Amino acid sequence: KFPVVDLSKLNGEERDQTMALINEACENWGFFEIVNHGLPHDLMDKIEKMTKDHYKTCQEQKFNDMLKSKGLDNLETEVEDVDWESTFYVRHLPQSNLNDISDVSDEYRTAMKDFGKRLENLAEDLLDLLCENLGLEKGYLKKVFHGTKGPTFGTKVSNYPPCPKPEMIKGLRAHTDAGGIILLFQDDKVSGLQLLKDGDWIDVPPLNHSIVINLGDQLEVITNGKYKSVLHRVVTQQEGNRMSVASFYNPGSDAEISPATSLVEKDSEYPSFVFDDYMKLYAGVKFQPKEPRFAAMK
Ligand SMILES: O=C(O)c1cnccn1
Ligand SMILES: [Zn+2]
Question: Which residues bind 2-oxoglutarate?
Answer without folding.
Answer: 242
